[PDB]
Amino acid sequence: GVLNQVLNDNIRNGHVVNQLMEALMQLSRQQFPTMPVDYKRSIQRGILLL
Amino acid sequence: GVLNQVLNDNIRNGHVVNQLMEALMQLSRQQFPTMPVDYKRSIQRGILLL
């Protein structure tokens, strides 16, 4: 009888985190041409922490 | 009635800066074969800042 703002049912069963981690691992595997190595290092370490 | 020293009208809009960016990025994508790693590192950091 009451309205509700329900989630997706792909979030309730945590799967979206798999999409996310896949994207993050792709971004780690890529090189940063325009930028130095220390920046890449910092980003990919922060990404591995997660 | 008055003489005026007018800019290009490609400066009055900011589009020159985009060619400047093109140039700086086409420098960031260049190894410096003559010179060591630290020199290149310095330059590429300096132009990332801009």
**Cβ-based neighbours of A47, under 8 Å, separated by 6 or more:** A24, A25, A27, A28
Q: Do A47 and A23 meet the contact criterion of CB atoms below 8 Å apart?
A: no
Q: Return the SS3 of A9.
A: coil
Which of A32, A34, A42 should we substitute to test contact with B (largest number of B Cβ atoms within 10 Å)? Answer: A34
Enter the tokens of residue B4.
Answer: 């005026």
Q: Which residues contact A33 (CB under 8 A, 6 or more apart)?
A: B28, B29
Q: How far is B40 from chain A (nearest CA, A)?
A: 10
- Resolution of this structure in Å: 3.3
Solved with:
cryo-EM
Q: Which residues of A touch B25 (CB under 8 A)?
A: 34
Q: Measure the CA–CA gap between B32 and B21, rounded to whole angstroms.
A: 19
The two three-digit tokens of residue A47, written as one number: 């990404």
